[PDB]
Design a protein around this ligand. Structure first.
Ligand SMILES: CSc1ccc(C[C@H](C)C(=O)O)cc1Nc1nc(N2CC[C@H](N(C)C)C2)cc(C(F)F)c1C#N
Ligand SMILES: CSc1ccc(C[C@H](C)C(=O)O)cc1Nc1nc(N2CC[C@H](N(C)C)C2)cc(C(F)F)c1C#N
Lengths: 301, 296
């Protein structure tokens, strides 16, 4: 249907079906046990961020590879259940959409994951070149196939050079997995989200150390953001002033799966509304902190 | 009197085949993954249809994506689903099964969605004339005993040729299910129930539990690689060696393949010894294959 100009937030990245089962004790091999609870939860970083952007009230769209099948049918219906637009999905003619079986032991919180990843072709620069960029106000890219994603980012920059400052598309990039191929993406985007895992892999022990050590990698003008679980989150911009927000921990922590995605989506949402980087950091910690006290994304607003 | 009805459970099995069983708190990538229709009575319908027997499934299901996959899979195998007790609310049960490719072991994490089971009221609406054999998977014994009493009432006013043969499966070691031993012409008792009651072999289990079955009944007990045994009114213990595949890859549903194959062979007029051997033959072939494709 008709999407108004410069209204949607696009998240380019991964999607996975997690069939999560909570059990009294980890099952012994060749045995049948009944789980305490079970939920089929749609995952993936860009996918979870779309869920949160929709609940926060922002029109959003997901762009990622999916192959026709039972897993894709469940995931598409789950995207629609959360009000996410899926018209940009790169549908692959062969393969399986990723899915996993996660067993969580209630006795000690241990989590055993049996992942089924058929190495499905990622979204390419050719696929992204067919996307009409006018319907988007913000494009968030989850670091995955950096060499192709750099061409996607160069296409958005070309679009912005011939647009007034009001109609320019804001860009954010997430370097979450500690893969050396992804570190070229630091030099792209207006906002760069770096994970605690990437920071620790590169020898940084805190958000302050990570932002001071990695700011030289971002392009001129960019804001580098780093969330650090119970230690809150920090941001660093061109003025060189480190910004910080304390965490807003829930009374009881029940589920941190997707807390980083809730933080990213909430920082994007607040900045796309014209709020300052300090205000967006606080909002991101506030929404991600509330999410940690809830199972899934229901009730974050 | 042409169809074989299986009353029991249907679940969606999300099966992951792995090189070795994963250690707790680890992340492993499986060799392959598939959505397969499961449940004891449901798997028996799959095998009865592949063996060439008209069959029907009776079990609780709730509308949704899981039920749509399961109904399409039942129709794909030529299984009649007009007897399904459709519930207005809930989700059809589902499970995560990890199958070790090195030895065919299967670990099941079952999610029973507390969906209402098939009741004696639901079964009372079933026209029994179109069935020649009715197999009931032990689940809600108090209600299933009323279903079994209804079939007995039907048989009392039928000539011996038009009587419906009945089989019962006591698979889970639940004390409430042991009342079902005294019902049916064939009673299938699992190795788990036998070991729970202190029996160390199929011979011990059949001698120790035959007093629980009704007069005339045949008690059957499969014992994985040790074959299977049966005991009838004549008191003669019958045995069949297993037909193990050279490489065991998937034992999920081997017991269901055994039960369906023993029912199929007996419904064709074969002896209890012939049915025991056929059950071991088809279940043994299934252990060397992923799923039920290729068992015939
Ligand atoms: C600033 S919001 C944020 C942003 C990204 C992340 C995820 C990322 C992986 C990371 O930074 O670790 C997390 C959060 N936030 C929390 N994460 C938590 N954990 C994460 C795993 C830890 N284990 C299980 C010991 C616990 C606990 C809390 C707690 F205070 F309620 C909060 C909050 N509030
Ligand atoms: C007599 S046929 C039969 C009838 C009922 C069952 C019961 C079982 C619980 C099931 O339903 O899987 C199993 C079988 N048969 C086999 N089971 C095997 N298991 C290895 C360990 C597995 N554990 C207990 C789950 C089971 C291995 C083999 C091997 F020789 F190939 C065969 C055969 N033949």
């Amino acid at each position: 249907g008709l999407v108004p100009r410069g209204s949607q937030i696009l998240c380019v990245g991964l999607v996975v079906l997690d069939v999560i089962s909570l059990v009294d004790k980890y099952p012994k091999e060749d045995s049948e046990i009944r789980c305490l609870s079970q939920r089929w939860q749609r995952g993936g970083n860009a996918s979870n961020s779309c869920t949160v952007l929709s609940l926060l009230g922002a029109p959003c769209a997901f762009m990622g590879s999916m192959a026709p099948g039972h897993v894709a049918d469940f995931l598409v219906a789950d995207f629609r259940r959360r009000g996410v637009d899926v018209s940009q999905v790169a549908w692959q003619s062969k393969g399986d959409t990723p899915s996993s079986c996660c067993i969580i032991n209630n006795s000690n919180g241990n989590r055993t994951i049996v992942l089924h990843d058929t190495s499905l072709p990622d979204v390419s620069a050719t696929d992204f070149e067919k996307v009409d960029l006018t319907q988007f106000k913000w494009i968030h890219i989850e670091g995955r196939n950096a060499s192709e994603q750099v061409k996607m980012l160069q296409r958005i920059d070309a679009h912005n050079t011939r647009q007034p400052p009001e109609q320019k598309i804001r860009v954010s990039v997430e370097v979450e997995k500690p893969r050396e191929e992804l570190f070229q993406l630091f030099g792209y985007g207006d906002v760069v989200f770096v994970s605690k895992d990437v920071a620790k892999h590169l020898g940084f022990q805190s958000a302050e150390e990570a932002l001071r050590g990695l700011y030289g990698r971002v392009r001129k003008g960019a804001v580098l953001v780093c969330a650090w679980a119970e230690e809150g989150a920090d941001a660093l911009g061109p003025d060189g002033k480190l910004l910080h927000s304390d965490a807003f921990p829930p009374p009881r922590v029940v589920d941190t799966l997707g807390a980083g995605d809730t933080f990213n989506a909430s920082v994007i949402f607040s900045l796309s509304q014209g709020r300052s980087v300090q205000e967006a950091l606080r909002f991101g910690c506030q929404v991600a902190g509330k999410k940690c006290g809830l199972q899934g994304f229901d009730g974050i607003v």
